[PDB]
Point group: C4
């Protein structure tokens, strides 16, 4: 087996087509299903897998109570084939309250973070064995992508942050060969806060669209040079911004370089990708809540500051339904590299207080060069039907 | 591994022998089992799989309530090895309220349709990745076979319809190579309405026996030329007709060319296949309801208009028990291609109102050149024992 | 992969050592587990599988009620790796209320019988597809081994009976190549009634120890010549007889040739095998009930009429616990062919009337040339703890 | 595939990083999960497996009552991929109330002991078949490691004891080739009592750190010469001793040669390993009870009698939480052999009497040459949330 190089052009797409849905919460009302959050998707050269952070319990289980909390020692990374819900036969790949995973063409890498807030440990597991680890560098919740890392020619990269969630922090970009950390580069450029990067191969390098939790409702960009380990960063140009919270479309701004200081504090994991001067992006439909999900293309959204002409919009989840995190993954076709995305569909607390748990299902779409229609694919569980 | 060509003679059979049964509904009363409908069977060159459309829920689950409806966003295509019931470890292959799947000798193709009635999307997934998609062309429930598609030398064909369920509609035949649509041919010939085709390889081409939902209780035939993409169509000659509803045997007719205008509106998915001048076919035992299931050979049933001499009848499901859709699949043997069929056994609403759900199990038979006896293999669940 | 020839000497053993146990009934009180009976074990060249006839339901399920009955349309053959209990992910291999399975070195053969008592059908499934079938020849419960068939050089043999359970019947020996019946030989020799054969390879032929349900408490022997399809039959010489019911050891007899007319009517499936002049055999400890299970070697038990000197006895299940059917399977080692056996542990009705179901677990032992101790490995469920 | 030789240097480590956690007990409160104890981990050359001794029942099941007992006929060895909890699809590999397993590079060996206390049987299963067996030699609970055995160049070694738990016993070291016992060496050297060895490859031989249940709270060492079958034994030098119970650190002693006669009676399975003159070891945090778990390096802990200078301590489980057995396993990396360990986390009786069962979950760490932080990873179940 050969290392992936992702050395094909990006598929020219017209939008996205339905790919997968797991119905986790509906199933949880009649079956033993893991409580999760922070899901993502990543594929080996043959097939795709769904991942999530378990909460060390199933939903219909008293331990599901107060699973709104992000960090407990019992969180583990779950991995199934895409479309297989997280049932009791699911493998817990590592201990993790924050993670990233990727396949380099030969084997899986998993980056798993657990332990004390002020002194966490990141474990690096490759091809079924622990190869490396690193401890917290800023003593304030060492944390990573919650989506797939990216490997080119046997070197995988992942973005990690340690430090304040509401002020300047310490972001580093790791380069890993067969599970071994071979280089660490500090964040460089104009991005001022980086969380939860959604990265993708853009041969010869890697590009990430992330979350600014401090001053920006525009999404930061991190560019990773795999030849020399140099880092650059900026913000997505589009005046239609991707974070939540954010200003309405008529009063939102981005200058490509600085955080916009528009409802900048807090955020949600998300994604976007460039195509020439244009930008494909997703976001919640609501400007303030993790509600709904839409995708569209922004004409000049990559190259032109404050561009706001969109086209090819698709509703993925209507605004009467809950969404959550979302992220990108890439899939190699015969001639081109395709871009796909998943959307986390969060149910329970804090928004729905009839139940005491917090969990999610997922829906997944992939880029298409063909045509498509309309729809809405929300979680679909009736909150009144659920065990509390 | 090589592409399938199905370039062997059809097996000469004497009837059918028991092959598989999943007991889905009996098991649902003591286990977490998916609610499904529209099942089918398809085999890779080594082994067979059962498929069905899930309803995004298990049976013993409040979400099973009112699952009689055909189209919701939570329907996904399920795929297990044949005989493995749809338990919680079942893979949801794609999002779909209508589907078709087939293996070309190298990899699986799945055709999955979901979304709004008036603006649906068909996704084409091959070897684990989304390769193509197409949107609705008549804005009225784009829909497909609910049984296996057929591939010859790397080109797979599938029949799809969009438009009225009770009048002229727009039927097209797609040719797909490794998930990529390479040609689309409009329906041609004398068939006037086409739904839910049951297709099979008949080298060098593909033949389908379908459902006319408009004016015929005789079943339409669609013939597909894989070399030049030409289409022809007609009706099964047999005066013993295959649809439900239909006239009594003494007053049913077919002229091989036109819908018979005998209780023609509505219908049920079904199958038949030719052997020289004769016809093997299945149908419900009841003339008006989806009750019972029988197979037989009609002497001159392929070539002689209105032929009514049957022989080699077998009861598959007695008329005191519910059936449902049925369809064909083909299995390559050492010297010949065999024909098999499945029967959907529908339980719950609208026929059985003690429970609020609608689901099914399956029974499966394959052609035999040997001998056999008699029996009846219905769903077998006691409606009074079920969770409602 | 090559066809099995079993052309090695039989392992010289000193007794048997513990190999597997599934605890099916204990687990059934806290989990969804199939209701079964008539289990057996058979191994491919790499690993062993457990088989049983399902009753189309799990135990904690209202459909488990009155599963004492031997024949319903919902019985299917289950197949898991040995030691994996029959959970809801278990594959139902075929429809069957009587079966036999075996691997020829290349693929699995399954012989599955279902349908009406007076007109049953036996299906032959090889390498995942239906290859042949045969109908009832005597119109009175066509039936077969309920343990493994045996293949030499690509030809598998299986023994089937059709006709009276309490008088002369019609027993035939089938020879099957890649699922295709190539020859059928009538029973010949002095055995007067044959049921439920436990067969094993004894290169160049196959030897079976069976059950006489009419006049013998001594077990019939069927010898199968694989070169010319000729059949011979007799009775096990040992004066310590293997069937249940039977006379006590002080008043039991066998002359090697005729049924002994000692408590001959009825019986239980069982096994024995020859080693030179000696015989290894198992049987229930009780002479009248399917209670307990013991094995031992009978000195001169193969060659000497009415021999009653035993040695190397082992208790497998003590006589305070229920047993049931038992049968042989053979496993190829580096230098020799080993003999193993399973014991069915039947719980529920008719012996235990607190519950309404009938089911079983299994325990499995293999021949050893080493040493061993003592024990008892019964089903182990507390009948008072079970769902009724 | 080739036999393992473990002919690489030991990885130089700085401590341990989180590797796996199964959350078995939390899950048992909302799912059907096996009752177990005495777990361990062992890896084939590609991936790791978790093993444990089942109690023939799930937790939420009346049969879980009084599962504190160590030996019943229904105990079987369970084997899943590491991180897959023991759900109902788990394979029971053999019948066993004491076990050891290991992979020689080609296939799995399992050593399974069951039967009467005074006359037990050890079965040896290799590559899926029973190859050998041995009976009890001292008629007093024949028993073995409860962790992985070790194979070099096709010979596997395992340590077994038979005899008193509180006085001199009969310990033997077996050498097994492809499941066949080829040599048995008696214990030799100065270790006076040996139980539950935790062994590891130390090319060209094998080294074990065990439990002295008679006179020592210092842990015995057994060294195994694989070339000539000679045995030597002693005690771990470290004055910080590894057993439980044990004296306080200020009053504990070891002289490397003899049991220390300090709270020596009883004990707990545990581990340690040498690196030059230093020692890496784990132990319960509590001196008298199986509570908490810590690891550290003892400077001079291998070579210097009574050394008590520790460094690089890590809390694995805080002392407010239950631990249990622990043991070592080795994983081959690219350049070196790494050492990992598991910790059994025992819940229920006798410590927690609200429930009537006794079971466990596990947590697993592996050696790292990188860095790490702090945490605590206990079982995590709320005893008040459990079925009793
Ligand atoms: C069946 O399904 C298809 C595929 O989903 C639908 O077609 C899509 O429809 C949407 C909505 O109309 C299109 O997305 C929109 O594109 C607009 C730009 O294109 C128009 O205007 C410019 C010039 O001004 C031209 O380039 C172009 O030719 C069009 O005339 C955007 O302006 C839209 O954004 C604005 O409206 C949306 C709400 O719709 C707001 O949320 C935004 O904030 C913004 O104000 C939007 O992006 C999409 O391009 C179409 N796709 C394709 C491939 O054609 C069909 O509509 C659907 N049919 C029905 C009846 O359901
Ligand atoms: C044990 O199992 C076997 C196999 O299933 C059964 O044999 C089958 O029996 C059925 C019913 O008799 C047969 O199917 C029937 O064939 C008839 C035609 O064949 C006869 O008549 C013509 C004369 O021209 C000859 O060609 C031929 O040789 C036969 O003499 C059809 O007329 C039947 O259809 C009519 O009756 C059925 C109800 O039975 C109605 O539903 C139809 O509408 C119609 O009126 C029917 O198709 C079948 O051919 C037999 N199979 C084989 C291979 O022999 C045994 O009967 C069964 N025994 C028992 C007691 O269970
Ligand atoms: C630890 O475990 C081992 C292995 O299981 C036990 O050893 C076995 O013990 C049984 C019972 O004694 C042995 O089986 C018996 O063999 C007898 C024949 O051998 C004896 O007598 C003849 C000469 O007469 C000699 O060949 C031989 O040397 C012996 O002296 C049979 O007579 C027995 O059958 C009779 O008794 C049984 C009940 O035990 C009745 O049920 C029968 O109907 C019959 O009347 C029996 O077959 C067996 O051979 C031993 N195995 C081995 C390998 O030695 C140990 O006993 C056990 N230790 C303890 C204390 O538990
Ligand atoms: C973030 O996480 C890291 C990694 O876990 C923690 O660093 C570890 O901290 C522990 C506790 O301090 C260290 O283990 C201890 O090492 C001591 C010896 O090392 C010091 O002293 C000698 C002087 O001769 C020097 O060799 C050496 O350089 C150090 O100066 C031992 O004495 C300790 O044992 C004693 O204390 C423990 C309780 O802590 C008792 O239980 C023992 O019985 C004994 O009395 C102990 O072994 C460990 O070495 C550190 N690891 C590394 C790699 O640096 C951070 O502390 C943590 N930070 C926070 C705030 O969480
Ligand atoms: C989830 O846990 C919370 C916190 O313990 C539970 O809320 C408490 O429930 C008790 C009843 O035992 C009340 O007396 C307290 O007043 C509650 N505290 C709070 C914060 O409201 C809650 O009941 C649990 N949920 C379930 C379904 O068990
Ligand atoms: C399935 O859903 C239907 C619709 O909600 C339920 O039927 C209703 O039950 C409510 C009481 O809860 C009544 O007020 C209505 O009269 C019913 N509506 C109809 C259409 O009959 C039904 O109870 C549900 N089934 C189950 C098992 O909960
Ligand atoms: C199993 O089925 C039997 C037969 O129906 C049940 O026995 C009957 O139960 C009813 C109660 O509904 C009694 O009125 C009848 O007298 C019973 N008949 C017999 C033969 O005793 C039995 O209850 C069922 N078992 C369970 C647990 O549901
Ligand atoms: C576990 O088993 C024990 C022993 O049978 C049960 O404890 C007994 O309960 C009975 C009543 O059913 C009392 O008569 C005895 O006093 C109890 N015996 C002891 C030793 O305390 C216990 O109830 C069982 N646990 C569960 C959950 O059923
Ligand atoms: Ca923000
Ligand atoms: Ca019709
Ligand atoms: Ca008899
Ligand atoms: Ca001790």
């Amino acid at each position: 087996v050969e290392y992936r190089n992702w050395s094909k052009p990006q598929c020219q797409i017209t939008g996205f087509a339905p790919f997968s849905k797991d119905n986790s919460i509906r199933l949880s009302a009649g079956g033993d299903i893991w409580v999760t959050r922070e899901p993502y998707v990543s594929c080996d050269p043959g097939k795709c897998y769904q991942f999530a952070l378990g909460q060390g319990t199933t939903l219909d289980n008293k331990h599901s109570n107060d699973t709104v909390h992000d960090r407990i020692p019992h969180r583990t990374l779950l991995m199934n084939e895409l479309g297989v819900p997280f049932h009791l036969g699911t493998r817990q790949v590592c201990i993790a309250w924050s993670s990233s995973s990727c396949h380099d063409g030969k084997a899986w890498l998993h980056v798993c973070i657990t332990g004390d807030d002020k002194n966490a440990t990141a474990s690096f597991i490759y091809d079924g064995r622990l190869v490396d680890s690193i401890g917290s560098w800023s003593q304030n919740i060492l944390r990573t992508q919650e989506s797939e890392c990216v490997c080119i020619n046997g070197t995988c990269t992942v973005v990690m942050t340690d430090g304040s969630a509401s002020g300047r922090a310490d972001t580093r970009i790791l380069f890993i060969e067969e599970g071994k950390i071979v280089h660490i580069s500090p964040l460089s450029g104009s991005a001022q806060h980086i969380e939860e990067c959604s990265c993708y191969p853009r041969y010869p390098g890697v590009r990430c669209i992330c979350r600014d939790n401090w001053k920006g409702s525009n999404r930061p960009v991190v560019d990773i040079n795999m030849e020399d380990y140099s880092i650059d960063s900026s913000y997505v140009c589009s005046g239609l911004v991707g974070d939540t919270p954010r200003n309405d479309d008529s009063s939102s701004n981005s200058n490509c370089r600085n955080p916009n200081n528009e409802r900048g504090t807090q955020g949600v994991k998300g994604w976007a990708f460039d195509n020439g001067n244009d930008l494909w992006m997703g976001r919640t439909i609501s400007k303030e809540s993790r509600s709904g999900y839409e995708t569209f293309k922004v004409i000049g959204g990559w190259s032109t500051p404050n561009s706001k002409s969109q086209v090819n919009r698709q509703v993925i989840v209507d605004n009467n339904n809950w969404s959550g995190y979302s992220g990108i993954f890439s899939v190699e076709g015969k001639s081109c590299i395709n871009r796909c995305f998943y959307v986390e569909l969060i149910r329970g607390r804090p928004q729905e207080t009839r139940v005491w748990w917090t969990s999610n299902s997922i829906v997944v779409f992939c880029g298409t060069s063909g045509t498509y229609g309309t729809g809405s694919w929300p979680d679909g569980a009736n909150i009144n039907f659920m065990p509390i």
